[PDB]
Amino acid sequence: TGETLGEKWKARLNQMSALEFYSYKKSGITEVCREEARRALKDGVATGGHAVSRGSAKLRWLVDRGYLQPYGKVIDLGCGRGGWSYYAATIRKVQEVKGYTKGGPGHEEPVLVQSYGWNIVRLKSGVDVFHMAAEPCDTLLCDIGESSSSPEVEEARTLRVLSMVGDWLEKRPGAFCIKVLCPYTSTMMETLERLQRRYGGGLVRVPLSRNSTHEMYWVSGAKSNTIKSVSTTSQLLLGRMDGPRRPVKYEEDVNLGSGTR
Ligand SMILES: C[S@+](CC[C@H](N)C(=O)[O-])C[C@H]1O[C@@H](n2cnc3c(N)ncnc32)[C@H](O)[C@@H]1O
Ligand SMILES: [Cl-]
Ligand SMILES: [Cl-]
């Protein structure tokens, strides 16, 4: 034994041919079509309302359902191109958005557009948040955690992120949304129970996530049980391996409009 449902999922995923993998990875998931956004942004459209990444749709999914309620000064850790920061800036109660990402050679760089509220956004590349000192904020967002074929690596990278965000959470933001790349190992589930006892919130699987990642979002507006919410997600991803391939559900891409606040 000792294999976790998610660890069993990850092995199977590892044992899957390329062929099994790419019909699996989107089997039955929710998705936005980026074709129009990607073309407009390539051409230089800044006021067409496009999201700079699929990230805006994911945060929209959570905010549309109250899984979190951004407000005040938003900090966006690992902001990449900025999908979460620009989405944050359209929300009425939000007043300031500060995004930080590493950028450079292998890493997404911030994209400058003029979606609604763009003028309260500042994205800063060249920042390794692991060496950034924590600062107060009202809404704490973190979308760091890069996929790996090894679950030991994914655990390691998730633990590293979670230790870092502890210092930010100790400043007591009222709202938060933290990517947990690997929630599925025994160490992670225990760690996550402990964090939830101290800081509240709970885990949510965003259905725009692909079947090839077990990521879940630790959000201030959930009250869910760690073991049940993570195990439920492992069985979901296991069960989409055994059935025949399901179609993708598209939602509309986000229209972030345009204009200053
Ligand atoms: C792919 S994402 C950004 C997704 C974003 N939420 C959106 O909607 O566009 C996570 C980002 O974290 C950056 N990152 C990874 N490690 C980092 C670190 N130690 N410090 C700062 N940024 C990091 C990656 O380059 C990556 O672009
Ligand atoms: Cl990472
Ligand atoms: Cl990452």
Numbering used by the authors: 4 to 264
Extract from the study:
SAM predominantly sits in the hydrophobic pocket with several notable hydrogen bond interactions. The adenine base of SAM forms H-bond interactions with the main chain oxygen of Asp131. The main chain nitrogen atoms of Lys105 and Val132 also form H-bond interactions with the nitrogen in the ring system of the adenine base. On the other hand, the methionine of the SAM forms H-bond interactions with the side-chains of Ser56, Trp87 and Asp146, as well as with the main-chain nitrogen of Gly86. Although ZIKV MTase-SAM and ZIKV MTase-SAH crystals were packed as tetramers and dimers respectively, both scored low interface areas of 534.4 Å2 and 526.7 Å2 as calculated by the COCOMAPS server.
In flaviviruses, the NS5 MTase domain performs both N-7 and 2′ -O methylations, using S-adenosyl-l-methionine (SAM) as a methyl donor and generating two S-adenosyl-l-homocysteine (SAH) molecules as reaction by-products.
